[PDB]
Amino acid sequence: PRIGVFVCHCGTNIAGSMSIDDVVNYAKTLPYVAVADQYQYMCSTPGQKKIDDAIKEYNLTGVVVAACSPRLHEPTFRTATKEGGLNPFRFEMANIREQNSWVHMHGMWDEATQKAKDQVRMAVAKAAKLEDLVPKSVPVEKTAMVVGGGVAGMQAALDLASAGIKTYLIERTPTIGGRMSQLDKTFPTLDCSQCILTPKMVDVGRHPNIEMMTYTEVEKVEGYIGNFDVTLRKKARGVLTPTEATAKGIVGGGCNGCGDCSAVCPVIKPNPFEMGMAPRKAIYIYHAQVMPLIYTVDFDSCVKCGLCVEACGDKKAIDLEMQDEFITVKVGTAVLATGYELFPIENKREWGYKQFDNVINALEFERLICASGPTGGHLVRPSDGKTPMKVGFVLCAGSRDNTGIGKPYCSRFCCMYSLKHAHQIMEKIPGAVAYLFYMDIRSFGKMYEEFYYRIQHEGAKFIRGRVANVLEDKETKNLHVFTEDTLLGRPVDVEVDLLVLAAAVQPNEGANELRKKFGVSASQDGWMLEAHPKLNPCGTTTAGVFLAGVCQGPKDIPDTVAQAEGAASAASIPIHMGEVELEPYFAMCIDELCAGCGMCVNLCPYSALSLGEKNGRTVMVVTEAKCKGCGTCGGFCPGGAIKMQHFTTPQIVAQIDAFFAG
Amino acid sequence: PRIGVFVCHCGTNIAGSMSIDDVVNYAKTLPYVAVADQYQYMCSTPGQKKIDDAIKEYNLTGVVVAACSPRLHEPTFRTATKEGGLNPFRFEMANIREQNSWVHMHGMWDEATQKAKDQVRMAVAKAAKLEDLVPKSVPVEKTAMVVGGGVAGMQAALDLASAGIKTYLIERTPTIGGRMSQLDKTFPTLDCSQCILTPKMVDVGRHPNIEMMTYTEVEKVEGYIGNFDVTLRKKARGVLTPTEATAKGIVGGGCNGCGDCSAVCPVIKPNPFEMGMAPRKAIYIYHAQVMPLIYTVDFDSCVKCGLCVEACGDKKAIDLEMQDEFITVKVGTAVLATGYELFPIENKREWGYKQFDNVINALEFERLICASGPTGGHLVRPSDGKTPMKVGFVLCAGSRDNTGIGKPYCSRFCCMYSLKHAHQIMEKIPGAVAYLFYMDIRSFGKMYEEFYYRIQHEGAKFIRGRVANVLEDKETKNLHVFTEDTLLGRPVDVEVDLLVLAAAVQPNEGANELRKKFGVSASQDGWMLEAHPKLNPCGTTTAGVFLAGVCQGPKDIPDTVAQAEGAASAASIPIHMGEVELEPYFAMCIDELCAGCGMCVNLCPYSALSLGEKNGRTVMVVTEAKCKGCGTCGGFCPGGAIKMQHFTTPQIVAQIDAFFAG
Numbered sequence A, B: 001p002r003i004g005v006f007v008c009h010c011g012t013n014i015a016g017s018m019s020i021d022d023v024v025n026y027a028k029t030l031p032y033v034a035v036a037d038q039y040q041y042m043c044s045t046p047g048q049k050k051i052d053d054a055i056k057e058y059n060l061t062g063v064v065v066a067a068c069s070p071r072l073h074e075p076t077f078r079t080a081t082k083e084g085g086l087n088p089f090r091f092e093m094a095n096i097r098e099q100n101s102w103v104h105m106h107g108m109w110d111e112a113t114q115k116a117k118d119q120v121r122m123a124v125a126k127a128a129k130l131e132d133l134v135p136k137s138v139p140v141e142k143t144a145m146v147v148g149g150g151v152a153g154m155q156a157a158l159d160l161a162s163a164g165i166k167t168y169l170i171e172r173t174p175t176i177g178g179r180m181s182q183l184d185k186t187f188p189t190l191d192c193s194q195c196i197l198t199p200k201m202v203d204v205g206r207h208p209n210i211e212m213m214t215y216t217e218v219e220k221v222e223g224y225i226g227n228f229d230v231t232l233r234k235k236a237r238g239v240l241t242p243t244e245a246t247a248k249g250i251v252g253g254g255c256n257g258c259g260d261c262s263a264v265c266p267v268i269k270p271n272p273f274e275m276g277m278a279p280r281k282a283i284y285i286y287h288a289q290v291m292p293l294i295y296t297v298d299f300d301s302c303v304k305c306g307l308c309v310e311a312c313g314d315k316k317a318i319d320l321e322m323q324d325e326f327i328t329v330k331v332g333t334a335v336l337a338t339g340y341e342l343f344p345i346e347n348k349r350e351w352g353y354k355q356f357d358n359v360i361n362a363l364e365f366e367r368l369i370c371a372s373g374p375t376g377g378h379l380v381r382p383s384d385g386k387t388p389m390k391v392g393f394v395l396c397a398g399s400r401d402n403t404g405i406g407k408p409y410c411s412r413f414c415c416m417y418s419l420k421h422a423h424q425i426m427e428k429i430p431g432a433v434a435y436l437f438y439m440d441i442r443s444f445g446k447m448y449e450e451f452y453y454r455i456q457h458e459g460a461k462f463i464r465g466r467v468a469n470v471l472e473d474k475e476t477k478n479l480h481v482f483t484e485d486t487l488l489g490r491p492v493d494v495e496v497d498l499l500v501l502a503a504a505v506q507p508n509e510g511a512n513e514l515r516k517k518f519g520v521s522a523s524q525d526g527w528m529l530e531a532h533p534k535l536n537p538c539g540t541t542t543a544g545v546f547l548a549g550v551c552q553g554p555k556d557i558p559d560t561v562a563q564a565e566g567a568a569s570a571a572s573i574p575i576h577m578g579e580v581e582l583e584p585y586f587a588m589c590i591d592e593l594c595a596g597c598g599m600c601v602n603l604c605p606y607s608a609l610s611l612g613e614k615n616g617r618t619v620m621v622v623t624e625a626k627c628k629g630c631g632t633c634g635g636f637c638p639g640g641a642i643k644m645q646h647f648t649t650p651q652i653v654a655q656i657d658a659f660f661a662g
Ligand SMILES: Cc1cc2nc3c(=O)[nH]c(=O)nc-3n(C[C@H](O)[C@H](O)[C@H](O)COP(=O)(O)OP(=O)(O)OC[C@H]3O[C@@H](n4cnc5c(N)ncnc54)[C@H](O)[C@@H]3O)c2cc1C
Pocket: A147, A148, A149, A150, A151, A152, A153, A170, A171, A172, A173, A176, A177, A178, A179, A180, A183, A185, A186, A187, A188, A216, A217, A218, A337, A338, A339, A340, A362, A363, A366, A413, A417, A420, A508, A509, A510, A511, A514, A548, A549, A550, A551, A555, A556, A557, A558, A560
């Protein structure tokens, strides 16, 4: 073997901590080293040219670069090694900047030089034993899955379908739309939410390239970037679509959404779409604008009285004995768009959320103010049904809170939606006054500051003080809000008819279960984690899975849609190519060393190992597609019958031996 | 003709303002009307089914729907009309909600009913004269253009190229990278900006599907969604790349970035990359990490001394007589990513930006604190070169300002970058204190609040008061910052060694010229406008043009990258299909009525009209692809020889006549 050692200065970031000349001379005197040389910026085009010229001149077998981190510049120098007539995987780095210079800057120079010599020696020892690998290319199934039917899921599904990829849209609830379907008007443009979204819901429902699967969950996921074998649970909806009815043999059809079933059902239960304010029968739709207008049956609350089937009549859409059906679907990529729920604000006892009647939260206020809600769009007091004339908005309710009860982060949109609600009350109830108890108004987006200016102009009162506690008047049920006006410098006691809490948001229910099924990690905040927080906010570390929407962190509908289309583009990249290259770190069983004990088989989380027949002997078989290169099996096998392709035992032991060489 | 009139209630939004029964009976008695009928939600699946059943039963020629706005529900009801055996364009709406109900709610009912009858009559009169149109499909060139080589432009270009579309990346400056290349570290994770971006710059420079054209501008654009004939100005760089040198015949090569030319050049000028703090020769690169390492010549400042060519020698890369070359490129879609510049804060005289030495702005501070900047990464006072020990940060400098000098909006990232700079000074200069004069700390993004907590923990002082004015001490050159501590309730006089202004951002220089070349409008704020502010933040109203990055409004690098990938996906949608359908509103010349006067030819902004030979007669010829359907020509032509396809004179005059019918 013939190895070249190229030591970067990183423009004095390394030459200001060690003696590069001494490191280079030591590399020259090292065994197996053909050429040792240095340059100011080895990651720059003259640096790659230097590598390539050295390879051609000295007939180099391998290249060692004493530079920054591999996690930073493996692709660069692997491509530089390829261009030059070598394999990309005859290359090895020695991290002498982020683990030598930046940590041994001060007052210790010959010690850092000795550390650099040791790292270069270990790198040369490994590279003298590296050999050729070729990355595995795997086919990509031409379908995609989008979990979540909110705005982010619908946008991602429409984007993929219009790019031409067949797409599955999984929604746990009987309708698509998400939270934006519950919103009444939207900041800062004050458009009606359903009006702007109903068009896109119709597009999703009609698109031939979208397989809209509502009221369905994801039981299990196995596979990788190539093929994800996703098992879906089709929950017993209880009612048949026209297509399914015709398939089952009923010519007359399935559900046409007439409503006779819910007209005759005698069970009455709260509506989760209306946050519980409104009744709905056992057979029901959330609202009149649901996209699949198919009238789910709630089997936890149905009493099987059979009146619904008599009402449905010849359509015969209702099957009261339906059971959870399971389907297995193979997909190439997956997009996660699970959204969010409101943090449980009844834990903050000083604001009497559950204990005082006239304290509500912002999604209940949005349903109360919507014209399609339980009221006729008239905001009335829950305690007595009278119209409020003073409304308080507690901003930051459970947010930027380090006490362990609330969330330590900002929920991003709660300042903006509180401004919207203040405007809505001041314009819908004549003479009503809105009080916002705020602590940093955050109107940062496009036209947001102008919206804030307009709300103040219309006459909302802004009191800069976090609410301390809330007391309920025993007779009028009015709410006494106690805080300090920090700018005025005095305590205040504002008595309002209705108190609205701008509660924090948290990941939806079951989101952690789903992201563990797909292999995604979590952030410090508890939201799903992205591949690189700056330059890759959509992709995750597990290949073939992408994030979209509030599930990655709270955001407004504009930012959510931008993120969703970005995720759709990233998921389309490998589908359009049809190939994708895996990293050749796989385990390879050496059969004439395997003894067939089968003990390694249970050490693989991905089930890549199995016992099979080769030449009569029972040996172990690696599904090289399923292997991920962790190395657990190869670190276990006592006989050394498992070889890890770029981190083989001879290579690692050569590194150890070179460290102890003196 | 046989017309069906279907009147929506919109769920009492219309039935609570007029008498729907009376409107329906009037429609029945109208001439040409075969069936008139009503439904609660005509935009819902039972509503489309009602339309289709009526069409089939009554053999309807056309459909009139008395409902919400056409701008909201033309696609829905055109598709409903298609499904049913009609042309989509035999359909016409009568807006009786947003222009009758919501504006005549109160105390006037029979008047709103009469208005509704009039609108229905006019709609029926037009629809009785509509006839069949088929949308024009035009081919899409399989290339794309990205104007701007910042993070948003580079991300969009990489996304399109990896989707497989050939892409042009136009950058006015000699290098790609943008502002993020000038940033030293990044909030909220404190990563080195160049370290995280250099990998992506290398990808862009090496991608075979990207035609990176640096130091080039867009002279003119003509065409449409199908083919954009974009003319580029290749400014005289003065130095030849190796490829261009080999093409011109120099075998030895072009520019290898050795630096001898700038080592011998005698001219010294300010470096715009370093915001003017640092010298650079007439032949130069911005920084050592520029992607095309090709050493532009600054011809406005070169004295043609010829020392550079002697230094370059046999490489012969320098051509001092080079001129602006022009190239015409045909592209299918275009992505605009022009970025931003800092608002001129010398106009705010109370903060002595240009008049006091030790007052700088945030990009100059970022260059001063970077280790690759004019200093060795050491922040020193401009007045005397001494190290500061107290640094003030004036947040909101020129922002949320309604006086007409500053900007009325929030610049989004200035609170976050000021926190980053406070951290950087407190960690780089031991014992230095950072004072932030703030008015609403805005840490809204992911991990931003935690970053704010950490900065306060490390010990930055947060004084809630907008700076009133700044006085300079005559001898020490120290800056006396005068404001009020609004929370403390007292005026303050903080004397700092260095004052940093967190200035507002504004659209880059020439951005308005470029967006007028491409046909994009502007926002209230002055940034480029998007198609729909909520559900389409990337596309513009002009088809085939998409927005990405700060050019649409200020944003952090994460949001910018999400927007850029969203724009790349939207630009890929029509390229992957290869077809795109234009709206059949074109002008069609009736030749045996045209007299060949040629006067209409100059009334077309798009040059779709011309005089041509047909049957010996000189008549007018419409390029139906170039026509956009405005109607100026057809409203001009005295002889009525131009027909507008869905808004013909007989149709409009029938509407007028029906209005005056009693
Ligand atoms: C009170 C309030 C007012 C607001 N007002 C505005 C406003 O005026 N303007 C604005 O721009 N933004 C507003 N927002 C923010 C806005 O709601 C969000 O930006 C947006 O809804 C994000 O949508 P999403 O698709 O990411 O999540 P969601 O809308 O929550 O959608 C997630 C979807 O995924 C489904 N789902 C969840 N888990 C699973 C699972 N395991 N399997 C399958 N499906 C699953 C859910 O049922 C849901 O349908 C407001 C928020 C609140 C709370």
